[PDB]
A = this chain, B = another copy of it.
């Protein structure tokens, strides 16, 4: 269980990825890295995980990703892939299993346009995590409700269970991690004028891949308190 402890400044650079496996450089509480892990699980891809201490990074990690961000994929050929959506698309294409993106070009384009509709939400969550008082909170509630009604409208026309059809697909996994953290951020009442989006969240929680990877509110809250202080122990909260 302590096998999951993060590597930080001073850690030895890791050795090569074994043939037959792919490696993800991750952090247990990162919603960006969660995207990639949901895909690895959904597709049944054998993999290893190296967690990175984002508040005390190893210098060698910048050789994996010059941006110094998680997630990063590394394969046995030594190829390196970064940016969460890029890593997810690469896995869908490079591995067998349930295809998570549509083959049809228009339907694929639709999933990417829905990701665009969503793309303000990660930056807002970033802002929210920093909110100081009830006035700031009232305002961020309105900002989230505007973004959520964009997403509600997609579901309203499609009349489908999920954003790509009646079966969960790539787009759902790409947006899920921010919704998972919404309870914990006290932002559930932003989805109260968006009834189909609320039902979508209930459906997501029933998905075997989502349920396997869900972090408890108490664990995310422990992480967050330490992260907001730039604690070098945040990323290993619980361990």
A89 at the A/B interface (Cβ < 8 Å)?
yes
Which chain B residues border A83 with CB–CB below 8 Å?
112-113, 116
A111 to chain B, nearest CB (A): 10
Which chain B residues border A81 with CB–CB below 8 Å?
106, 109, 113
Chain A binding surface, main DSSP class:
helix
A116 touches B86 (CB 8 A): yes
Select the residue from A81, A106, A112 with max chain B CB neighbours within 10 A: A106
Q: From known contacts A90-B106, A93-B105, A108-B93, infer whether A113 and B82 are also in contact, taking CB-CB under 8 Å.
A: yes
A202 at the A/B interface (Cβ < 8 Å)?
no
Top 5 A-B pairs, shortest CB-CB distance = A93-B105, A94-B105, A90-B109, A86-B112, A81-B109
Q: Which residue numbers of A lie inside 8 Å of B, CB to CB?
A: 79, 81-83, 86-87, 89-90, 93-94, 105-106, 108-109, 112-113, 116
With A90-B109, A93-B105 already in contact, 8 other A-B pairs whose C-beta atoms are closer than 8 Å: A79-B106, A81-B109, A83-B112, A83-B113, A83-B116, A87-B109, A93-B108, A94-B105
